[PDB]
Design a protein around this ligand. Structure first.
Ligand SMILES: [Cl-]
Ligand SMILES: [Ho]
Ligand SMILES: [Ho]
Length: 83
């Protein structure tokens, strides 16, 4: 059985690992199937914020992530959705 990550709109296979953002923190999750085991990680703010529409930039393990506001999603919150 697979795990669904709604923030990415994608399923993950067992043991697969991905990132899931909160407003002020990043969580890394592993699929156990169908439930994911997550661990909240301490994240620093990116020096440069490439996120659009008020996206919060969270940097962890090198690369940057965008926690998008409602009505926006994608790698840089450049997709209009639920607003
Ligand atoms: Cl499936
Ligand atoms: Ho929208
Ligand atoms: Ho809209």
């Amino acid at each position: 059985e697979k795990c669904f990550e709604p923030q990415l709109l994608r399923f993950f296979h067992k043991n697969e690992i991905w990132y899931r953002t909160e407003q002020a923190a990043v969580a890394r999750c592993q699929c156990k199937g169908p439930d994911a085991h997550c661990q909240r990680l301490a994240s620093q703010a990116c020096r440069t914020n490439p996120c659009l529409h008020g996206g919060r930039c969270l940097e962890v393990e090198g690369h940057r992530l965008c926690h998008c506001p409602v009505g926006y999603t994608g790698p840089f919150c450049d997709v209009d959705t639920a607003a």
